[PDB]
Design a binder for this molecule. Sequence first.
Ligand code: HEM
Length: 418
Amino acid sequence: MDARATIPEHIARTVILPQGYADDEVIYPAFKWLRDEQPLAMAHIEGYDPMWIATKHADVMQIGKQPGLFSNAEGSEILYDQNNEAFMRSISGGCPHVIDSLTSMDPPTHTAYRGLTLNWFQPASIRKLEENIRRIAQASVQRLLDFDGECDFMTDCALYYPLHVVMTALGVPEDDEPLMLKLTQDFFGVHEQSADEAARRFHETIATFYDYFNGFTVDRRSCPKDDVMSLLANSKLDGNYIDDKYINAYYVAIATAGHDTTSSSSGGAIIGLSRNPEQLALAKSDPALIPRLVDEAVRWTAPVKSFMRTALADTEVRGQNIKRGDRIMLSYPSANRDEEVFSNPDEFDITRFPNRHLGFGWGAHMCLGQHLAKLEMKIFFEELLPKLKSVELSGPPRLVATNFVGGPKNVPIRFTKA
Ligand code: HEM
């Protein structure tokens, strides 16, 4: 219906809708066409707002850099169809954000709330978790090795270690694993009963989680620890504690943001190594390559498929006239296969350097957890790879049919033990 839309319907459907993300050979050719022919253009398909599709690495950085011009707060920062956004608005007091977490905020609010934990998540602070992360990683590796050379790398291994890491970072006890899996896999899981009923279930379930998290907040105000829950519980702004709604959103955001992404990227690494056995040999003879392996797994997997922005003023990008109120989809996968930046970007190559990928985004909201993600993946692969003589896929990987946080959910493998 919007006269400015120039992206062919079939291409627009492929890049916007969830289904195509389940197959690399569906999604990546569509983005290649856009990068070649309509690098920044408008799409409008039935059931969605009109939107610009940012397919180029340069543009995704330019937009992400300027939160004053391209907003997280103003519209939904997640790519929902109109029906789902309206449902979200109806359970969130009219706001297009289900909780008050960092990705829902614009500066200066954003800057203040991110600032509460920014230092904790920097490499020097994160390095103190090394011993704990190594214990957690070894447990997951043992889990895999307990199989007689056959398992699902995701469901039998990679599902676990990153949740345990985010739990240790927060301060959630080991025994609460079931509740944390419910949080990230069930309540905030991918869909893949009336509206009133769904809304009732939502309000009940989130209240249950927030009651649970409130107990930690109270605990840490009397008995401080070096974990994130303690940091936030004991934080003040303008001389007062942060409201429970911001604290609990922060706990949920950290758990959900840090689990699937890391698991998925780990699966991506195993797919890459399975298809490229020489690279497994390389990482085994030179463990100092593992950080480069980790960055390549994140670039190539690109588990976060999109975030959205709303233009707050008329403005120009790649010679296009973006108008106030226009929504923009940021495609991290398309940026990560941009030929102007990467040679042979469809190839998994652990020696790729430099590797200036946007798997963690770029600019004001750039992944808070990026340093924790890189450290835990490094430690995991340091522990796993010496234990493996070989690894191969036993069947096709199954990827999540989503336009938000996807990548591998199931990675059937065979392996021989070193
Ligand atoms: C391979 C693993 C991961 C990937 C690919 C990833 C990716 C991303 C991306 C793309 C964003 C949006 C950035 C932007 O708008 O520019 C983001 C935001 C965020 N990530 Fe991650 N992430 C990963 C791991 C983690 C971990 C382990 C944590 C926490 C322990 C985490 C916490 C967050 C938080 C809190 C935000 C919101 C930050 C803000 O709005 O200021 N992520 N992540």
